[PDB]
Scaffold this active site. Sequence first.
Site, mmCIF file in Angstrom:
data_model
loop_
_atom_site.group_PDB
_atom_site.id
_atom_site.type_symbol
_atom_site.label_atom_id
_atom_site.label_comp_id
_atom_site.label_asym_id
_atom_site.label_seq_id
_atom_site.Cartn_x
_atom_site.Cartn_y
_atom_site.Cartn_z
ATOM 1 N N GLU A 1 3.711 1.841 2.503
ATOM 2 C CA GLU A 1 4.773 0.843 2.419
ATOM 3 C C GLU A 1 5.677 1.083 1.194
ATOM 4 O OE1 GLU A 1 1.319 0.050 2.733
ATOM 5 O OE2 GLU A 1 1.628 0.257 4.831
ATOM 6 N N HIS B 1 -11.641 -28.941 23.791
ATOM 7 C CA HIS B 1 -12.526 -28.239 22.870
ATOM 8 C C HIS B 1 -13.965 -28.398 23.345
ATOM 9 C CE1 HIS B 1 -13.847 -27.987 18.361
ATOM 10 N NE2 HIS B 1 -14.384 -27.043 19.101
ATOM 11 N N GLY C 1 -8.018 -22.946 15.603
ATOM 12 C CA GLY C 1 -9.317 -23.341 15.064
ATOM 13 C C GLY C 1 -9.822 -22.380 14.013
ATOM 14 N N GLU D 1 -4.866 -9.941 2.989
ATOM 15 C CA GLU D 1 -3.866 -10.076 4.038
ATOM 16 C C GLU D 1 -4.009 -11.348 4.866
ATOM 17 O OE1 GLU D 1 -5.677 -7.351 3.282
ATOM 18 O OE2 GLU D 1 -4.206 -5.829 2.831
ATOM 19 N N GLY E 1 0.839 -1.186 0.000
ATOM 20 C CA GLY E 1 0.000 0.000 0.000
ATOM 21 C C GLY E 1 0.875 1.236 0.000
ATOM 22 N N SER E 2 0.288 2.423 -0.018
ATOM 23 C CA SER E 2 1.134 3.599 -0.210
ATOM 24 C C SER E 2 2.059 3.899 0.981
ATOM 25 C CB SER E 2 0.273 4.797 -0.516
ATOM 26 O OG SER E 2 -0.717 4.922 0.477
ATOM 27 N N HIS F 1 -0.441 -3.234 4.889
ATOM 28 C CA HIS F 1 -0.805 -1.854 4.746
ATOM 29 C C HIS F 1 -1.629 -1.349 5.925
ATOM 30 C CE1 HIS F 1 -1.876 1.929 3.174
ATOM 31 N NE2 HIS F 1 -3.168 1.640 3.166
#
Lengths: 525, 525, 525
Positions: free
Chosen positions: B27, B280, B400, B46, B24-25, B69
């Site tokens: 970066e 769980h 999970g 992402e 992104g800008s 970003h």
Amino acid sequence: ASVHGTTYELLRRQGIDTVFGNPGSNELPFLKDFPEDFRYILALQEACVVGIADGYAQASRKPAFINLHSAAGTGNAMGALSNAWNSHSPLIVTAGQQTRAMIGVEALLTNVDAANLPRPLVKWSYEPASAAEVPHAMSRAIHMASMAPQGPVYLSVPYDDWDKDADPQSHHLFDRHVSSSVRLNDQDLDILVKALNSASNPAIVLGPDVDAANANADCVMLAERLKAPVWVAPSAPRCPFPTRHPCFRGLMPAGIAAISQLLEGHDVVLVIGAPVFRYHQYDPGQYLKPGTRLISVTCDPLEAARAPMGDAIVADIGAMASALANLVEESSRQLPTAAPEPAKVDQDAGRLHPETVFDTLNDMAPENAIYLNESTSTTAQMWQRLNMRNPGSYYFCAAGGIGFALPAAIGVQLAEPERQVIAVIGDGSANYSISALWTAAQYNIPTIFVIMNNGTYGALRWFAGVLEAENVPGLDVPGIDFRALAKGYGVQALKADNLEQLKGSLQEALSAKGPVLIEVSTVSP
Amino acid sequence: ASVHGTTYELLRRQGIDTVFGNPGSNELPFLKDFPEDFRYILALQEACVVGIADGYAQASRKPAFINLHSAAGTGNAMGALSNAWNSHSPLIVTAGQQTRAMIGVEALLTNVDAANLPRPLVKWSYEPASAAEVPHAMSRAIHMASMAPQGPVYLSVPYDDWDKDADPQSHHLFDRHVSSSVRLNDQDLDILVKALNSASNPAIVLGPDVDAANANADCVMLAERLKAPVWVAPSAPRCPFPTRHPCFRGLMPAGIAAISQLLEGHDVVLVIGAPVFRYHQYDPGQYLKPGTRLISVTCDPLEAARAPMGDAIVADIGAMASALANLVEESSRQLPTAAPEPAKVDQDAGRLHPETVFDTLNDMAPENAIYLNESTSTTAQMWQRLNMRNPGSYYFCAAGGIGFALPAAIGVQLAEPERQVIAVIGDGSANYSISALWTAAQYNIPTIFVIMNNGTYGALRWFAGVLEAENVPGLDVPGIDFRALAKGYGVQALKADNLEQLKGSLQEALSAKGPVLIEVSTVSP
Amino acid sequence: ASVHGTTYELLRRQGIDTVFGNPGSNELPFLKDFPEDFRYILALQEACVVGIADGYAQASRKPAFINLHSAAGTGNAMGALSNAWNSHSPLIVTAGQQTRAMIGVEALLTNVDAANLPRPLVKWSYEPASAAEVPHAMSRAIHMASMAPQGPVYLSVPYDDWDKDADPQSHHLFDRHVSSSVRLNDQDLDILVKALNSASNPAIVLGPDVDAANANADCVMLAERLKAPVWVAPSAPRCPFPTRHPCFRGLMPAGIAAISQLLEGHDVVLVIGAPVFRYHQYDPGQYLKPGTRLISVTCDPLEAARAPMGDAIVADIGAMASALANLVEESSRQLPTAAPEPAKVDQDAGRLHPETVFDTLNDMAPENAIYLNESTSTTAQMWQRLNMRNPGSYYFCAAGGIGFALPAAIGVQLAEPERQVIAVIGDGSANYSISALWTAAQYNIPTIFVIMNNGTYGALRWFAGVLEAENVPGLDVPGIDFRALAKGYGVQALKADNLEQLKGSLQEALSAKGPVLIEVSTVSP
Ligand SMILES: Cc1ncc(Cn2c(C)c(CCOP(=O)(O)OP(=O)(O)O)sc2=O)c(N)n1
Ligand SMILES: Cc1ncc(Cn2c(C)c(CCOP(=O)(O)OP(=O)(O)O)sc2=O)c(N)n1
Ligand SMILES: Cc1ncc(Cn2c(C)c(CCOP(=O)(O)OP(=O)(O)O)sc2=O)c(N)n1
Ligand SMILES: [Ca+2]
Ligand SMILES: [Ca+2]
Ligand SMILES: [Ca+2]
Ligand SMILES: [Ca+2]
Ligand SMILES: [Ca+2]
Ligand SMILES: [Ca+2]
Ligand code: NA
Ligand code: NA
């Protein structure tokens, strides 16, 4: 069983028998039916509660348990938590919460978003989701405080939880043993040992986690074998080495350039049990000079990560110091020669130079005295002038937060009833936690408090002269009568306006059977 | 030097040569002048970037570096971070921030309160206070991700920092070596070894940190010496043991009562590299039966603290497993006998039973295949039916969080170019990170994706039948054509509506030179 | 009553009748016995769930209710929450937690430190301390989302709470009415009105909270009375004014110097319903030129605090816009003249210029169409070329987080079934939330998706050309077949490689009875 009965059983089974506290209504259901085998140490304000507990934990080398009142009580303690974070003090801080039925409406005394309150100064912070979880949460707190790197933790408990039924499976918590007593694997430890054996001019730097681990004697053996000078890492919270041993070189200056200059010419610098480094003044320059490499042994990943130079090993300081001291070769180099004694500074029949005070303390105190320092402009002289042969002989606020030494000296004296504790505290610092004096009086904990009275925040006034900062307000603290404050809280009080009176007051204090405060008139900086 | 040049030098000097990212800008000033010795792996969303990086880090057993970003990009990745936290994945997550001059006004793309955003799913989260601090902050990030217990970390960097001058003392960061390769001290290790030697009926339970440490072969030696059965701790993210070794007993059920019943009659249960335990379903009962004691070796203080039973040792799993395997006696008990092979389930010429799918994969896949599981209703059968002889052969979303296996399988295949990766993913799970397929196509990473298509969220529908929960919405996912999705992202696609077609599709996929997706019509639950 | 029954009664009594969700096992006890008067809208990944809900809330001007799965599901949604924070979207985000009995052990699917997870992107984030508190916590969530400034909120609920008995006093929650419909007191409002009446050359700047409040028509009256030009504040998430009204002057450039130059010569600039200002590029200069003063009316204290210039009034935008529009005098100045129509850009029989696309959409779409923009390099042209006469006609990701428009366009179309929604989305942006297409297909929500396919992240490539940044990786996204992706999720798909095909595809899409995706081949930047 109730949550109350189960929790006290877990505490006793994990070695806890004392509660440091200042009570409130959210805590009454915890403190009721207080068990006969426990003791409760009351202090009048929460910075004092936590300071006392902190000195007790550091000197006893075991966790201390604290009970505070909701958000306000926790909040009053958070400056004390800042020091405990930096000293790795194993503190279990509990606070009472409102009953679960009124947390939502935010009744008076609700601790809102409780676990976020002491962050970022705790290793673990939690409020359980049900009463039956409280013993397990307390078990978590005990182990989180106690595992390396040790540190403060926080648990908030709704007051209605204590009378509820416990889970019968909570008994499995009682006798859990959790160890972090670890050291570098054999192959890599042999590489480290060979590096130390091979060094031409090694130096050793020790920090507070050495004294916490009682690794001091092992570090003496290590320094003797390597024939290496030993310094204490800067801003030292504890004393990790006998200060008149021939290898001892004193407290390092808390500056980047000063430390690299000091270490110049040492090819390998082994740091044990310290951050790299707790600098203070900004003294920009090289972290290390060419020719010096650094190896750090630290109990704390956060220390290893943030060091700006050197290799690091994250492990238990006691285990590592013992293994190194027993594995290294005896170097054929000559043992370092002891530093010379400090000079006597000229002293007239008027107000006392701090140097005179420390010399006289060193002359008169028992060899196993324990000192605390919160006389911030005199730290270097203190470190030069007190012969501290034994472990656990020195404490200084690890985060720089004053208000630590007065209460901590009471906790240290409670932990070490046969070692005379002498706290040396500036007139400014003395006020922050002044009400802690009452706990010494009430429990007859015979700490000696030496108040260095020069009428000003001397360390600040110096750093203001440094910057040629003119017109700084708030640096003077005239008009405090410390003997009247001591009388206010039931502590015997003496004044020393000159050397003769200092000697006489110390003789009286050292013979006394309870706490004593000596107000010393010291020279203005 | 610039902060940009210094930072890439630190990264290469610390072994990092790949950036997983979606740009992104904020970066662009980091990614410009991208060094020729690095590679950049683009993914289209992402969750996919971080999943790919996570599989790469877990399989390579080294940190992976990510660039996202600002807040929105970081936020899209936070479900992936939840899995990485549970798997101890060493991920260095960087995100670009607005230029320092507009952070205050909250210009578009400002990441407000940036360090708090990925909490509580990271070990360390930070934004530097100046450009010159960026290399040191990056050094902290590298070491925090990499020290035990490994985990994700987060660093936010204002885009204007990269072009500023670096501190010339940053060179001391480049070659720092930080170790956490530690084990229990000799005295206490001898006590543990004697306890294991003395046990009458020991059992061993292994978790994912065994496979992360490549401690698998040592654990085989340990189990052979103790003549002990070996189970995998529940909700297993990795496979820590050869699944057809005679000691192997499978994946533990994720229930309190089920595990204590399983362990009944074992006097000492040694858990290595697992939480105690990742249950769980709620299956209340005894944590352990009378007669069983538990000892846990874990790399993570948080695991040791929260275990509801047993002793614990916090240490490196590789160092501990090696020391135990080499120190214990050879028991004179008989070696456990291998579990029998699973039965063949009846299969007609219609839709495939999952058991048939796993049997056929086991028949046809190379012996060094690597499997990923995100077919949530078939995990038990998968673990019974795949012979996984080697380390690094199995991954399952550790928190999970589905949407892990599709991208992670691409990262694993990038880490292990000579081992065929086969991801077995349900039709529901396949959608979460479907766009990750594009990265496999673009970089020609030859992962095989086996989509188990039964039209429903089967694991949920089962847990809803369990509770007799009627009228639950949202459990069916009809109407997805996975061959068209694969075509959409440039991946060759095959369908298998019966066994003959499954065999043919697998033969074609195994011979292919790029990624392949097989849509398998499986039986409705 | 149970917590389940009480909570659904509170929701219906507060106007909530739809749950946007992606289910998991911690949520099954909430979703079971789902009430017949509610509807459930499933989406296949949580960024899509929250994007759909967000478009629905923004278009309906009422809160939307979301149910996500634990930490991983919440985490997958946090990029979507970043946009919702910037758009003030009233979103009630709920997530299921583990049963209270296993939260302590951190069973699989425990959301650890849950309330901290979505911070800092929510107004309020909470987990209740008991089951009986859940309805009150839900009431808090509803009102926190809905009070000005509106925004997302987060509530975590242990799954075992739903079946517990509710507090019988929870009925008092059901019909609570909470208002923030407030305006400046009369005396100070008269001062503001006199300032506007007295200005010689006023300008008006409007932001997204105008459209949220449906204050658009009042702002038209205000601009007509003051005879003032009207601009839209930069980085606009919504359209607050008819774009062919004579006062309209377009979207402001997102730069400090550009905005002060634009406003030069205006003596009073009245900003309503916008931050001051959402700049993007760094374009340093004066915030305002000499001679210009600024007055901001904002619903958000955080906006008023951070504005670098001007006075501010924190109040409801609907109430303020109505009061100002009805109180100001009619100026005798001439009404501004309408901007001229944009020029037709030359177009050959090949790939489409974006300008051609917007002109053709404007030619063919109904007058009450609703547009969404995630074609990031073409925003200025879009704003010049679409006549948007009505409120609620434009949405753009408020935090710049792409992956918003595709799902939001489905939520907007669900909120406005009689207004044709047309989402214009770049080929890069389309992938982030591609799986949202399935929800349009399954529920037959007839959104039109126009994919602008130029093969690259054009906005980035431009900002990289800007900085002369060479050798930036990851800017191209070749090799995506969007008609195959649409087929994958059951959406009719068309391609337009030239103008004739664009016209034909739009005619077919506009006549269709379900969602349609058109892949448009656009010119490379
Ligand atoms: C809790 C707290 N408040 C304020 C300070 C700042 N401070 C202050 C106010 C010092 C002056 C202490 O004065 P003193 O009388 O105790 O000792 P000296 O005169 O020897 O400096 S040293 C120092 O760091 C602090 N460190 N901690
Ligand atoms: C990120 C996220 N969202 C939702 C869930 C809840 N969930 C869901 C929705 C599962 C269904 C997966 O369906 P599948 O088709 O991949 O496999 P099965 O049919 O074998 O269950 S399993 C499960 O835990 C989750 N775990 N993680
Ligand atoms: C969630 C997320 N990830 C990455 C970005 C960075 N980014 C990216 C990757 C853009 C390119 C979008 O490309 P597109 O094909 O949709 O449109 P254009 O070609 O017109 O730019 S615009 C932009 O701000 C972002 N804003 N949000
Ligand atoms: Ca007693
Ligand atoms: Ca003083
Ligand atoms: Ca190259
Ligand atoms: Ca399925
Ligand atoms: Ca109905
Ligand atoms: Ca594009
Ligand atoms: Na705090
Ligand atoms: Na967060």
